[PDB]
Amino acid sequence: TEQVMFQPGHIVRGIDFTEDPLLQGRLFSYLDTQLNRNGGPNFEQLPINMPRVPIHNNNRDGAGQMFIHRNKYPYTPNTLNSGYPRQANQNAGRGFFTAPGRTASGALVREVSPTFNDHWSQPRLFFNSLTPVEQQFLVNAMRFEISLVKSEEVKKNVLTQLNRVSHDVAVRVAAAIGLGAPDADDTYYHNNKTAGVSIVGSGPLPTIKTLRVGILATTSESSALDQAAQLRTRLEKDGLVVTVVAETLREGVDQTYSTADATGFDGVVVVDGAAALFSSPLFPTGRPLQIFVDAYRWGKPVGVCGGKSSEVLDAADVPEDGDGVYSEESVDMFVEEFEKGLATFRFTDRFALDS
Amino acid sequence: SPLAAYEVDDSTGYLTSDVGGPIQDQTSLKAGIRGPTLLEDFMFRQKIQHFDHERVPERAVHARGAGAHGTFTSYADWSNITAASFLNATGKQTPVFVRFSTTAGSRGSADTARDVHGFATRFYTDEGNFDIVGNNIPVFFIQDAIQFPDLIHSVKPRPDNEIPQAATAHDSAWDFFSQQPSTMHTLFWAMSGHGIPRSYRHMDGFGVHTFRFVKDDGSSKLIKWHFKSRQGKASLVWEEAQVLSGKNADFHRQDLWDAIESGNGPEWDVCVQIVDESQAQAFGFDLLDPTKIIPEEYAPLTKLGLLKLDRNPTNYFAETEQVMFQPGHIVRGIDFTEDPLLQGRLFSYLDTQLNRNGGPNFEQLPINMPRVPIHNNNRDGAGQMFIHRNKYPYTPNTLNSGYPRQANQNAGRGFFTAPGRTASGALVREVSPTFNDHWSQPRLFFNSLTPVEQQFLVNAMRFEISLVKSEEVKKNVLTQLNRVSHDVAVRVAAAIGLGAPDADDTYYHNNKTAGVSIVGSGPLPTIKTLRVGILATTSESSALDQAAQLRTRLEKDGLVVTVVAETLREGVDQTYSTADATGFDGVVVVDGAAALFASSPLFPTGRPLQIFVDAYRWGKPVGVCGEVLDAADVPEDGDGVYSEESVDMFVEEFEKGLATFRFTDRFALDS
Amino acid sequence: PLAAYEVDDSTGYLTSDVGGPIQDQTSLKAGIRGPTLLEDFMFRQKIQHFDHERVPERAVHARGAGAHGTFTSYADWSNITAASFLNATGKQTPVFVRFSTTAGSRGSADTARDVHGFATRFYTDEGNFDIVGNNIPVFFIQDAIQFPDLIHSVKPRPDNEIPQAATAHDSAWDFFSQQPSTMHTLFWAMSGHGIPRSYRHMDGFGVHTFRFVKDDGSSKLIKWHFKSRQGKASLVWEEAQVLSGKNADFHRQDLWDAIESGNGPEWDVCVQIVDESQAQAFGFDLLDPTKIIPEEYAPLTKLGLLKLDRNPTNYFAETEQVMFQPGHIVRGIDFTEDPLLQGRLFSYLDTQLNRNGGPNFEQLPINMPRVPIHNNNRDGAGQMFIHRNKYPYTPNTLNSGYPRQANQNAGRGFFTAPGRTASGALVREVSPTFNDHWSQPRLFFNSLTPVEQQFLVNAMRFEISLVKSEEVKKNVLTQLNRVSHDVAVRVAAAIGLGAPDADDTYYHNNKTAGVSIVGSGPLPTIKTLRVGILATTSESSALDQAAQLRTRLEKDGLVVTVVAETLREGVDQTYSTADATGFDGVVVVDGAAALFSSPLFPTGRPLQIFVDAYRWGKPVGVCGGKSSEVLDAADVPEDGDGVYSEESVDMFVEEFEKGLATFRFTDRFALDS
Numbered sequence A: 001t002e003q004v005m006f007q008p009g010h011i012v013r014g015i016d017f018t019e020d021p022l023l024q025g026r027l028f029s030y031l032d033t034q035l036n037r038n039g040g041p042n043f044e045q046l047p048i049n050m051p052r053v054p055i056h057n058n059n060r061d062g063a064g065q066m067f068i069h070r071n072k073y074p075y076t077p078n079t080l081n082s083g084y085p086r087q088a089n090q091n092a093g094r095g096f097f098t099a100p101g102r103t104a105s106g107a108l109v110r111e112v113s114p115t116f117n118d119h120w121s122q123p124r125l126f127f128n129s130l131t132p133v134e135q136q137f138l139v140n141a142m143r144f145e146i147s148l149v150k151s152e153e154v155k156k157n158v159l160t161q162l163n164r165v166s167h168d169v170a171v172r173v174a175a176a177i178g179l180g181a182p183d184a185d186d187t188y189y190h191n192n193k194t195a196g197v198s199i200v201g202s203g204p205l206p207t208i209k210t211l212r213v214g215i216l217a218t219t220s221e222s223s224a225l226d227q228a229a230q231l232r233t234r235l236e237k238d239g240l241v242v243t244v245v246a247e248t249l250r251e252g253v254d255q256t257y258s259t260a261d262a263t264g265f266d267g268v269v270v271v272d273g274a275a276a277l278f279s280s281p282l283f284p285t286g287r288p289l290q291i292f293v294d295a296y297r298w299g300k301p302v303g304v305c306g307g308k309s310s311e312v313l314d315a316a317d318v319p320e321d322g323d324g325v326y327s328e329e330s331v332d333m334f335v336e337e338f339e340k341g342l343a344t345f346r347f348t349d350r351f352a353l354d355s
Numbered sequence B: 001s002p003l004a005a006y007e008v009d010d011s012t013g014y015l016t017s018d019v020g021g022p023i024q025d026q027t028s029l030k031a032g033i034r035g036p037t038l039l040e041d042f043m044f045r046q047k048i049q050h051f052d053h054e055r056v057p058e059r060a061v062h063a064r065g066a067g068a069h070g071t072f073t074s075y076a077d078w079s080n081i082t083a084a085s086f087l088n089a090t091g092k093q094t095p096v097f098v099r100f101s102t103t104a105g106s107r108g109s110a111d112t113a114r115d116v117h118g119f120a121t122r123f124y125t126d127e128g129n130f131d132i133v134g135n136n137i138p139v140f141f142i143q144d145a146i147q148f149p150d151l152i153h154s155v156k157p158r159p160d161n162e163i164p165q166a167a168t169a170h171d172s173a174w175d176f177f178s179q180q181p182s183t184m185h186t187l188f189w190a191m192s193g194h195g196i197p198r199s200y201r202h203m204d205g206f207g208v209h210t211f212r213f214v215k216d217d218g219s220s221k222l223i224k225w226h227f228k229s230r231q232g233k234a235s236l237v238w239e240e241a242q243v244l245s246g247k248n249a250d251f252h253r254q255d256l257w258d259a260i261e262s263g264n265g266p267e268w269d270v271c272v273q274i275v276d277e278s279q280a281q282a283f284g285f286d287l288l289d290p291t292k293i294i295p296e297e298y299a300p301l302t303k304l305g306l307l308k309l310d311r312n313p314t315n316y317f318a319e320t321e322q323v324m325f326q327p328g329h330i331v332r333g334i335d336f337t338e339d340p341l342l343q344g345r346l347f348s349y350l351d352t353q354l355n356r357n358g359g360p361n362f363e364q365l366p367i368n369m370p371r372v373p374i375h376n377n378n379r380d381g382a383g384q385m386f387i388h389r390n391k392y393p394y395t396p397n398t399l400n401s402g403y404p405r406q407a408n409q410n411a412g413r414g415f416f417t418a419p420g421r422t423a424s425g426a427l428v429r430e431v432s433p434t435f436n437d438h439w440s441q442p443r444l445f446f447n448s449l450t451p452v453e454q455q456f457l458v459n460a461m462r463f464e465i466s467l468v469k470s471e472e473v474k475k476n477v478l479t480q481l482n483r484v485s486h487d488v489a490v491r492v493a494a495a496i497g498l499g500a501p502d503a504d505d506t507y508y509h510n511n512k513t514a515g516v517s518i519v520g521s522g523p524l525p526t527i528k529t530l531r532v533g534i535l536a537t538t539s540e541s542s543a544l545d546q547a548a549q550l551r552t553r554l555e556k557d558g559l560v561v562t563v564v565a566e567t568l569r570e571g572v573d574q575t576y577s578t579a580d581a582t583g584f585d586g587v588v589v590v591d592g593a594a595a596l597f598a599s600s601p602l603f604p605t606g607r608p609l610q611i612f613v614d615a616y617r618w619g620k621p622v623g624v625c626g627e628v629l630d631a632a633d634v635p636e637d638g639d640g641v642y643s644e645e646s647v648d649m650f651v652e653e654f655e656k657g658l659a660t661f662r663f664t665d666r667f668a669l670d671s
Numbered sequence C: 001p002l003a004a005y006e007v008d009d010s011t012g013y014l015t016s017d018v019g020g021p022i023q024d025q026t027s028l029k030a031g032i033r034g035p036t037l038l039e040d041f042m043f044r045q046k047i048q049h050f051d052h053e054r055v056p057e058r059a060v061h062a063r064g065a066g067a068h069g070t071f072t073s074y075a076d077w078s079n080i081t082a083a084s085f086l087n088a089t090g091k092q093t094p095v096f097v098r099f100s101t102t103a104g105s106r107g108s109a110d111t112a113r114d115v116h117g118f119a120t121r122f123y124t125d126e127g128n129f130d131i132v133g134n135n136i137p138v139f140f141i142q143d144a145i146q147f148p149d150l151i152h153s154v155k156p157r158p159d160n161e162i163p164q165a166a167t168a169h170d171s172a173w174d175f176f177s178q179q180p181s182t183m184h185t186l187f188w189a190m191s192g193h194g195i196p197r198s199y200r201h202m203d204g205f206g207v208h209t210f211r212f213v214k215d216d217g218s219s220k221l222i223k224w225h226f227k228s229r230q231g232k233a234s235l236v237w238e239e240a241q242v243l244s245g246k247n248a249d250f251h252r253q254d255l256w257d258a259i260e261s262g263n264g265p266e267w268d269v270c271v272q273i274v275d276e277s278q279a280q281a282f283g284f285d286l287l288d289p290t291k292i293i294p295e296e297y298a299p300l301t302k303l304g305l306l307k308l309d310r311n312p313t314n315y316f317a318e319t320e321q322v323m324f325q326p327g328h329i330v331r332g333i334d335f336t337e338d339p340l341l342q343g344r345l346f347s348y349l350d351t352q353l354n355r356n357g358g359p360n361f362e363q364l365p366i367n368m369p370r371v372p373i374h375n376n377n378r379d380g381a382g383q384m385f386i387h388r389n390k391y392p393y394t395p396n397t398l399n400s401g402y403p404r405q406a407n408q409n410a411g412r413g414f415f416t417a418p419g420r421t422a423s424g425a426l427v428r429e430v431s432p433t434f435n436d437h438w439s440q441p442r443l444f445f446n447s448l449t450p451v452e453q454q455f456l457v458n459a460m461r462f463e464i465s466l467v468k469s470e471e472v473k474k475n476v477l478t479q480l481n482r483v484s485h486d487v488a489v490r491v492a493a494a495i496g497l498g499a500p501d502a503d504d505t506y507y508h509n510n511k512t513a514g515v516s517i518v519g520s521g522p523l524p525t526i527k528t529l530r531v532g533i534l535a536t537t538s539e540s541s542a543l544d545q546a547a548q549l550r551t552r553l554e555k556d557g558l559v560v561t562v563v564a565e566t567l568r569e570g571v572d573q574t575y576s577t578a579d580a581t582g583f584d585g586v587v588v589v590d591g592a593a594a595l596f597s598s599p600l601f602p603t604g605r606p607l608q609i610f611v612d613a614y615r616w617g618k619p620v621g622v623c624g625g626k627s628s629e630v631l632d633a634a635d636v637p638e639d640g641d642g643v644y645s646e647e648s649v650d651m652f653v654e655e656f657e658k659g660l661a662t663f664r665f666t667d668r669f670a671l672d673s
């Protein structure tokens, strides 16, 4: 991993570049920068960088040279090595070749093409294509970052640009930073949308295998560990990664509350045998409940398995009828419902919207 | 062998990038047929980036040198004197790589500079790589490694103008020698024919330092390494070496390359002098002092095994340029001594490879790899070529079951420090008083040379010191030379028009030692590979006839024969224009060519005669086969001058001349 | 000039690099005969430094030497270029120049046969401007992508790394014969231009066509020619070979000494100027770096004077570390679409990463500009600057928009010539306008004198006779034959092959001025030329004669060496260290006639110095009146051109100095019939 040295210049017959001026300059950078990383010119000889076919060329020497070349006439044209290696091109040896229809014409210029000039219509196309809660998240990310910018001039300049994409975005961001948005400039505004760029609107996940389920349990109650064990069996059958959490480790418990956090799980289930937990020298005050509350606040499916849910759900201020909130006595029924919630992935109804 | 696995064959196939994509590399990609080159031309940039980065720093010393592969074969099971595995059975073979070199010149400097020469040998043993990084001279200039940059700055070019290349013939070098009297012993060696050996194959190798051989029972003895040439000892003469430097800067590397290709790979007996620990100061000097030899009269040589070089490298850069020797590459059964020069070398050779390689994984280069598995917790670093499977690379561990396990005297055939070694006393930056005699051994050496050999050494000093500008440095030089020998100080002073200081007999003596003289070492034990230049003409069918008959008689005896004429044709190897006496160990004129020795657009005026005269002047066997001796002012009754009409009689005499190698009666001596 | 970076060590106690006073002569040991301690930081810092002194040699032109100087403009050149260093009569700009061979490594000999570098940095008031040129005005190849092929072929064979600093081997001649573009440069390299007498006696050429660009945007096509004020002069091959052994440092020593003696070398910096419309008007393509513009079509314009007059203080820091780039360009100059130049622009920025080990190589003193730097380049290994601006991005408001963009209309920016265009397909194809590889090599050959043509034939005979492959030798003859049938026959004769039948497609009888060395007339100055006076200590009168001659010769700025058997007052060198390659002329004092055996020098040495000097074409003579003993022993005719015999010291010197200006007496060399 550390030594792999990628290059867009690693191209093969059948593919070619275009005159995108960002691409064009990348071709230079990635060959040059490996000299810095490797400290020498033979970086293509590192195992991870070697090809899976023979190499025939007249590159020689350099620090770290791992090959012993037999050909003592490494120049072209030669007769003393019978003209080998042979030149490869479109018509011989499956050579790389530049697409032969490509041309250039005109002055040699350090000028930007005016065809590149619209910087704002596509940002607006993207923004239009997000769902309402998704738009809020994006606005909230800009509110977070721009609020940390100390320069009032920079913040003003940021609103001028945002406003060219969307007046509404500029207004909503402006609100968090106590500035006024500039007046609407509609040159690049439009209502068009495009498919396939929204995350929130891309539907339930097509698989839940590998998703993480934290089962919050206790060692106080033999019944809580038995519930956790039955739940584990039923959930592992479906390829979910189960972590049972309790105050201390023992057979069948994976993690202590001291080390557990909601960020470690895609869904959180409390076994009702553990209801009393929801102070110890064994974990920070309020840790078990905090894991559940965090999971709920962040949009994750959450539930209580065993039949008695109101004590846990009330302590967490989580409504029993909420979408992505589950309560069943039946392990089988619980898992069926909960797995739908894992595919939904995020319950976006739990997030406030600008009015 | 790690080397075979890394060989790359390019005798067939289409050109590819370094990642296997077929490409071309002859024309840049351009915007139009007369347009500017495009940045998107990855074929151009990958090829030119490689070229731009081909060079690595040359070695800080011994930058000029050449290498070969071979084998070392043990003569015996040496368990009685060392635990070393490569020496533990009669007939045991270990692959070797040797690099020979000069010391001061940069990597493109001439082979035939006057200098100390390196002789570095790696044994790829079955218990790890073992290097003996030696020189052709058994003693070194300085007594403490911390002084190495002082010595080297002083002999390398002056740092304002970088003049002169590959030469001690300048003020700074003689200033250092004259201020630092430890230098005298090596200076005397370097000013003798040992400074200008005939080839890498005609010199010995020495470890220089006292080392230890350590047995499995923990006991130790003190040793010196001496690699003894089976080709014999031979030198150039200085005027010849100077011309050779210009005519063929590659003379020694070519000589070695050719000897191997012709099935005449050079051989050395690897030997040691072995003495007891109790004898560290028994011989009148301290065995920790790298400026002293053990005279062979006090400790004879034991022959351990045969070193033979018999395969040239495939890629000089990959193998010769990249080989990274270290005296730290040591194996169980060998230990260090407290020689302060050796002690500091241990640090320098591990560090300097970082400069050369540009990263820490230099031991992974094929030429540096061992021939046994590597098990350790060294990780990462630029240019990491391994993928380690052990994800717990720390000791002590349980998560990898405690592997790799520690090796030591009693486990895993570990290296161990000789357990009889101790240290005692204050922590000091002081020189031992036992190191103080800087002059008796230089005198011993000088006493052991033949009279004309002594004359050559005097003349080398006369040559160099006459090029020192500073009158003060020259006077300081004579002061030191005088402490070795009043006669040397007098004779050198005569050349520079200064007066030698009065005799100071503190360190004068008349003792001699065997095995250090080149001239005195007798005729060469073999003449195979030696070079005979036959000077012929195309203007005579007789001349090319006589040449061809000689060629048959000389070639079946293993000699390398070059027939020289005005222009090339069948049977002619070299034109007069490219020929020079430095190219031959003996020169023969066929009498059918006599008119050439009396102008041509095909070679410089007087070239044929000059070859013959130079060869004579430089002491080589010379002869006419069939006025040539008159034209050359060469006495027909001179030793090593041959004149016969019989082809077989000429060759028999001439080949005795080749064994004698140099006819030293042709050189004037001081009265 | 770089005074600000100098470190003086003429006084003081030894310190570490962090200024702690220390010693550095004895290691710290556990006991007087004990092992060395790891805690000895004095030892480790000194040895670590030494262990890391070396840097990679340049990939080409590794062997070279440099000096500082000044360029002075002769006019305000505003009417043809916006270049600031050229904008006023007498305007001065500091320079640094490095001269070099091309193929050999560090330590190889100065007097190898090779193309030579002549790289000049102008530290101008609008940025560093480098002209990275050679002593030969044409290059071997037509596209930069071929450079590694050319260089691999001429450098040592990569199995054994033989031979050093030489094109005399199979691979080089294989390449030349398979790549016929190489013919023009090859003919230059095989002439005396491959073995110049010194860096001061050769010219410098930019090789490529460049552009001069006026402030109004208009451009003209130019070629740079730096014309030596010392004259042109070469060695003879046989002399070059001996000198390579006797003094590998000959060119660097010559330059160093000329500067120290107040004889710093000079060149007129010139250009040929032509219109954009004349790119294909001269019967070849100006984008083709294998072609010259004959001076009969475009005369030289003298822009200013380049004089080198100060030697470096530290060779490594200054000469070894100087990192030239043709991308060091200034407003008023632009590139052309020469495909060899085009690729160079990439190579010289990249290769300094290898040499320097990191990206801040422009910070080394020798590479720094003499104006302020304002940019957003940051960090990198060895960063010496402490940048104040904490907003190094454009566009910014937080640093008020600085640094400001510079361009044609603001801030005296560099700008690409605005009349330049490109058209057509993206192609890896060679222009057919580049296809004539042979007519200009013939033009060059035709322009040499007869003995000069012989010398070039003899260089080829020498090198090609060392090529082992009979297929390569035949292919070589094929190519030489396309330039000249006569060249091919004469070369063939030495290698015992037959030349192929004449192929007259490219044959012609045109000549051009200014390329011949032999034909360039006597040297305009003899200052710095070397005269060896061969004398003896046997006769106090020979020393007297030598002293008199010295006084008379030194008065005219010649460097005089008196040689005798042994050193004493008045004697500079002994016979043992003397050689004819050390002198431009040789005089024997007639009191020393007897020397023409000793333990003090090799047999025949005094005579050999004289005979060598004669056979290599140098002025030689005997001063005093008794000359026949010496001249007869040397087989030198008393009536020979360049052979002097006079009793009168004054008269001897007058005649001898005319001979030093003639420099070489070419009538001593045999010619093919």
Ligand code: HDD
Pocket: B059, B060, B061, B062, B065, B099, B100, B101, B117, B118, B119, B120, B133, B134, B135, B140, B144, B145, B146, B148, B207, B208, B209, B290, B323, B324, B325, B341, B344, B345, B348, B349, B352, B353, C047, C051
């Ligand atoms: C403390 C510094 C120091 C000292 C005192 C010595 N050397 Fe050393 N030597 C080096 C520091 C060094 C080095 C800088 O580390 C080199 C440069 C390249 C390398 O691998 O190590 C080296 C290279 C080197 C080579 C070249 C190996 C090769 O061919 O690649 C030989 C033969 C020697 N040395 C031999 C000796 C001998 C016989 C010494 C005295 C007994 C000696 N050196 C003292």
Ligand code: HDD
Pocket: B048, B052, C058, C059, C060, C061, C064, C098, C099, C100, C116, C117, C118, C119, C132, C133, C134, C139, C143, C144, C145, C147, C206, C207, C208, C289, C322, C323, C324, C340, C343, C344, C347, C348, C349, C351, C352
């Ligand atoms: C595309 C590769 C390439 C090509 C086609 C050339 N060169 Fe170059 N040259 C280099 C790649 C290079 C280099 C590898 O980048 C060097 C090595 C060290 C350096 O700084 O640049 C260099 C060094 C170098 C030096 C040494 C500068 C110094 O003293 O430090 C000179 C004088 C030249 N070159 C001159 C030329 C001329 C007159 C050329 C043809 C017109 C030429 N080069 C073509």
Ligand SMILES: [Ca+2]
Pocket: B158, B170, B171, B172, B173
């Ligand atoms: Ca000096």
Ligand SMILES: [Ca+2]
Pocket: B192, B193, B194, B235, B236, B453, B456, B518, B519
């Ligand atoms: Ca000798």
Ligand SMILES: [Ca+2]
Pocket: A039, B358, C357
């Ligand atoms: Ca590095």
Ligand SMILES: [Ca+2]
Pocket: C157, C169, C170, C171, C172
């Ligand atoms: Ca070759």
Ligand SMILES: [Ca+2]
Pocket: C191, C192, C234, C235, C452, C455, C517, C518
């Ligand atoms: Ca000439």
Ligand SMILES: [Ca+2]
Pocket: A109, A110, C414, C415, C416
């Ligand atoms: Ca521009």
